[PDB]
Design a protein around this ligand. Structure first.
Ligand code: ADP
Ligand code: ADP
Ligand code: SF4
Ligand code: SF4
Ligand code: BEF
Ligand code: BEF
Ligand code: MG
Ligand code: MG
Lengths: 686, 683
DNA sequence: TTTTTTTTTTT
DNA sequence: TTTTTTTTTT
């Protein structure tokens, strides 16, 4: 419970070694506060988890890293630091942690990423063949990867050498060679993914992202045991959303495909029995029983195909969302029985998998193990899906339910989808009650000056011993920067995107001509808006580092290097650069914000949530839209001031901050800045 | 900190005490210990304080005065814990009353385990129900029925003294004899009255076992953060700790199959009738059944493996050397730890859900779930320890026992860490802000390293280690009398040696030079045997086992005060904290050097681990505790300036053997006389 | 009452 | 080096 004397001493010595390690170190009261509270929670002195809000630039990273590393070493535990995206992962791994390793020269830290971001060596080799192709029928059936053209081949040769000259580690984000979305789909499914994941076991600090932490809690195969984990959820305000996205379930239900899956599974169970018989035979493994079971399950799937197909236009890609997540009684009945039958088949598959796997006819057995694993995976998905479709509520809210008919290989496949609108109870099972003590931190945790929204979405509760701390900002923003809202003619509506982007490009272009700022950042709410904006500043492309051209944090580095040379450099990007990115002083003195980032509203889950909110007589704009845009605006504005020596301005090109009823509330959530309103040149939409 | 108001207050109380003790003689180490205990308890000087003061210095008042002052200034409960119930009673009926005069608003209570309280229901049944004559209907019911009428009458006078408020309900606080069988039936409302008194008492007088339990089952004491804790006779703490931290759980395969079947059916019935609005994955029937099957198969395998180590179909035992399990058994234990921990969590979750939630049926399910939780708590802790290779830098003792109860055999698995320093660190040292550990025997070979290694108290943590001096003039105040026993106190000579000791003792009584005597034995066997030679002296003997211990002490004091000779005879409980100044005790008879029994699986495994660390087990486990024991025993005699008399030690190995020097050198310097012994007539 | 539109990650 | 069974609790 109580912090040891060795531990407090160790934290104090490291934190003091910081004064000599940041030569321009200035004491920060909230940093000290957050060190103490983080130490208390992680060491098990006062409560379960800590949701601690500390404003942008306070220095939260070192605030949780220092105590976390101390307690990890003393307790022989693993500190897991999770952030919102790979760019912020890279920043912790490449900038914060190395600075801390100057103070702790034996610190061992790694970063963890999902398998999909790692290049596959077989695909890379095939993609980097000098003599690539024939347009053979043989080639068409043998469609192992071909280098589309010669320059792309050259890319793959470069990446292939740089893998073997060890510049590249295997991750899409960790090379300077730009790679295409489709080319990455080709490149990525001993190998870099396993040599990367091996380092987790011996690392004291693992830098992950929230998606990977969610998958890790449910898989239970990527991180160490939860009881041996110290977990910090940096930029924690994204956890519910990520959790909701992690717990979405989708499975194919196309009846002929489903019947074939059941046929194969029957055949596979029987062959396991005849070749590697278990000691006790599962009742469900008896052939008459097993295909009685499979026949009932198939007929249920066929009827659900008929029913769902009556909703959608025959023979076209389509979708149908059930309002309020309420299924018709017949469909719910079917779902409940499918949950039963697919769970039973899942359990049978798991049983055979364990039996075969314990047996470790080695090659024959390995083939059967892989097959049984694939069947097990399929029934796992099924079971989760139908158990979710059968719920009338989950965490006090409906479950979004919808079906799609989508195309692959010229064939339509029927898919069914379920998403819990609220997810708190699942967070309780996967994180809150599984990890002894967790830090949830961010500069934007409170909504309307309350932890109420967060408590509703995450499930964290005072009654369970969760603490909620709101810290102050040490910087005097009015003495360091200014918010500038140009008097644009057009609000950034939907009818005005071209006009507004052209007027923004014009003003921006004079700010570049002003030569007042070597370091600037341009932030957009959508890729389309950004790509559209780049059409107006083409003559400037040499000075721009744009998200998409090189991996995000490699762009950040290039920016740091140019600004250090007295060169004008402009970062252009999206959400990844709008949050957590740390550019001190001259590295970022002018931030351009394209818009208020109101979230998109077209998803089945978001509109089902909207109808549920309205059924509870709550306004969806107030609940699901305005806080998202407020939080985003606070983070974006927060890119500017990172120190008492930071300086400059935040241009916000959304006149609605003064124009609409919600503009006052948005500005009130921000740090206090003087506001200037300069005039705008003519915007020539092209 | 130690404010001026608090210094003055402690000062003033210690001032009034001089008038309440008119035999007062100034005691320097007493003053020192008072200042150190106040400093530590107020937080001024580190974390915890291990302070050794010699026997009789007056430690009780030394820690009581600062503790009460500081506890009162703030809003803390001073928990005074000592080694046994007899010492609890001595603090409660003697010392605390003595400074309650000075502080007439002082509130103090004693806390004991639930086992020491009578269940008023059971007492009522036994007193108000005639013995049944042999009738199956009576047998089938197995209602509490007194074996005979004598027993019924005695339960009736126990109930009369209870309801007349003449008996507090504690086994130790009535003079009516109660054998272990009858107390087993009388006990499970006095217990809740005692706990309520804990809630607003300024001083709570406990024992070490109850503190340990309070630290793991967090319900007997208040929030640790609001506690001041003194551990009187603290040299017992590691042992208590070790004994409390032993985990055992049944693993009988048929029994285990039964328990898993019941838990499965119980979970399903909860699901069907009080479904929690969130289903835990493990509660899905296909998964809970797969889980329980795997668990059962592991338990059956473990049963087979262990049955290979133990004598065939009988009461048996098997201990794993060095606490190292065969690799297959380690694998099984690790998997059992996971599986039982998961089932424990599921039972807890369901208990929480039912509990937060059709009163009669649901109450029934809640009690069933709480028992299931209990069973899986025991299992998961046991396997978690069985899985460890080391705890607190030492092996984990691991062994299985097969015992018979009602015509069937039960298989049990037991684990106990040999060192518990880290567990004491997590449960005590890091849980209470400031703790006094005090005793007359804290150092061993004139160093605090033994206590440091056993307890986990360390300087690094800001724990202080103080050794005070004795004011008393032992050489000018008493003698060590070692008679020339013909036979050593070995094993095939015990009858002979007890007959000689009885003869010498009998002449010491016939001399009439001592009004107060204490006879101390190392075993109940030896004491009972020696009593066979003094039956004619029975009327002046007060013997442990005949009345509760401290009530024997009180009778002893009354008789001695009225000029009648009195002889206390007892064991460990009379050997340590007992205080009899002056006339109450001028002759102490020590039967033996109390070397500890070397019989425990834990003690054997410790012996071989010491050996593998190239340490002589005699030097670490037997001799130091014999020295502490002898020092404490000898320390019963001299309690003051003007105390007088002698300590007869009937173990001639203090002169014959080579550890004799070291035992004698560790005592206060006493002249040693070696008188002749009468012939020993073996009865 | 109010109002709003597409980022990021992993399975 | 040599030792041998008290006490208390969940
Ligand atoms: N006491 C301090 N003095 C000076 N710079 C600091 C101090 N603490 C942190 N920093 C640096 O100031 C910036 C703080 O930013 P960061 O930790 O990214 O803030 P946030 O809390 O938004 O994550 C970083 O560059 C960090 O290295
Ligand atoms: N200053 C003193 N002078 C004389 N007797 C004292 C003094 N202080 C305490 N005593 C008494 O001496 C006896 C021994 O004290 P006690 O606390 O039993 O010693 P120990 O330190 O071994 O526990 C008690 O009766 C106590 O009240
Ligand atoms: S293992 Fe994953 S990465 Fe290595 S080759 Fe097979 S697929 Fe490509
Ligand atoms: S003690 Fe507890 S159980 Fe025994 S009677 Fe009083 S209340 Fe009922
Ligand atoms: F809150 Be900081 F800008 F990451
Ligand atoms: F040290 Be005293 F005998 F309690
Ligand atoms: Mg940050
Ligand atoms: Mg004492």
């Amino acid at each position: 419970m109580a912090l040891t004397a060795a531990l407090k001493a160790q934290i104090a010595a490291w934190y003091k070694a910081l004064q000599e390690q940041i030569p321009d170190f200035i004491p920060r009261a909230p940093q000290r506060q957050m060190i103490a509270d983080v130490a208390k929670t992680l060491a098990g002195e006062e409560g379960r988890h800590l949701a601690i809000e500390a404003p942008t630039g306070v220095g939260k990273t070192l605030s949780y890293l220092i105590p976390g590393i101390a307690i990890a070493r003393e307790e022989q535990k693993t500190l897991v630091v999770s952030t919102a995206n790979v760019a912020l992962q890279d920043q912790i791994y490449s900038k914060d942690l190395p600075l801390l390793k100057k103070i702790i020269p034996d610190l061992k830290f790694t970063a963890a990423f999902g398998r999909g971001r790692y290049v596959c060596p077989r695909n890379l080799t095939a993609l980097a063949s000098t003599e690539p192709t024939q347009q053979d029928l043989l080639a068409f059936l043998d469609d192992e990867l071909t280098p589309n053209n010669q320059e792309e081949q050259k890319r793959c040769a470069k990446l292939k050498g740089d893998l073997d000259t060890y510049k590249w580690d295997g991750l899409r984000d960790h090379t300077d060679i730009a790679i295409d979305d489709d080319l990455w789909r080709r490149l990525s499914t001993e190998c870099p993914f396993f040599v990367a994941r091996r380092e987790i076991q011996e690392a004291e600090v693992v830098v992950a992202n929230h998606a990977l932490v969610m998958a890790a809690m449910e898989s239970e195969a990527v991180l160490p045991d939860p009881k041996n984990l110290l977990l910090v959820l940096d930029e924690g305000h994204h956890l519910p959303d990520v959790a909701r996205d992690a717990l979405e379930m989708s499975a194919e239900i196309t009846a002929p495909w489903y019947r074939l899956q059941l046929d194969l599974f029957t055949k596979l169970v029987a062959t396991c029995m005849e070749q590697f018989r278990p000691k006790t035979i599962p009742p469900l493994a008896i052939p008459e029983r097993l295909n009685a079971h499979c026949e009932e399950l198939y007929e249920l799937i066929a009827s659900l195909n008929n029913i769902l197909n009556l909703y959608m236009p025959a023979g076209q890609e389509a979708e149908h969302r059930f309002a309020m997540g309420e299924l018709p009684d017949e469909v719910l009945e079917i779902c409940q029985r499918l949950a039963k039958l697919t769970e039973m088949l899942r359990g049978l598959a798991e049983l055979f998998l364990n039996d075969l796997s314990e047996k470790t006819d080695i090659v024959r057995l390995h083939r059967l193990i892989l097959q049984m694993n694939r069947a097990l995976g399929m029934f796992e998905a099924q079971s989760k899906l139908w158990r979710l479709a059968s719920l009338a509520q989950s965490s006090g809210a409906p479950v979004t339910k919808w079906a799609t008919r989508e195309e692959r290989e010229g064939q339509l496949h029927l898919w069914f989808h379920c998403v819990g609108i609220r997810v708190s109870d699942q967070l309780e099972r996967l994180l809150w009650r599984s990890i002894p003590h967790i830090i949830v931190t961010s500069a934007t945790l409170r909504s309307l000056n309350s932890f109420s929204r967060l408590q509703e979405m995450s499930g964290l509760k005072e009654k369970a011993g969760d603490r909620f701390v709101a810290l102050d900002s040490p910087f005097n923003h009015c003495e360091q920067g200014k918010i500038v809202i140009p008097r644009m003619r057009v609000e950034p509506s939907i009818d005005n995107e071209e006009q507004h982007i052209a007027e923004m490009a014009a003003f921006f272009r004079e700010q570049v001509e002003s030569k007042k700022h070597l370091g600037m950042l341009v932030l957009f709410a959508s890729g389309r808006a950004m790509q559209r904006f780049l059409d107006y500043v083409t003559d400037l492309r040499l000075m721009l580092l744009v998200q998409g051209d090189q991996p995000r944090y490699r762009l950040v580095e290039l920016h740091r290097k140019r600004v250090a040379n007295g060169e004008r450099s402009v970062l252009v990007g999206l959400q990844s650069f709008a949050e957590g990115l740390d550019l001190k002083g001259d590295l970022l003195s002018q931030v351009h914000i394209h818009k208020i980032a109101f979230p998109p509203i077209d998803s089945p889950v978001v509109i089902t949530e909207g109808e549920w909110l309205k059924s509870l007589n709550r306004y969806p704009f107030e609940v699901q839209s305005l806080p998202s845009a407020s939080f985003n605006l606070i983070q974006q504005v927060g890119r500017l001031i990172r120190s008492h020596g930071c300086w400059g301005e935040v241009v916000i090109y959304d006149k609605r901050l003064l124009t609409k009823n919600y503009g006052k509330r948005l500005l009130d959530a921000l740090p206090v800045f003087p506001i200037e309103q300069p005039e705008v040149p003519e915007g020539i939409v092209k």
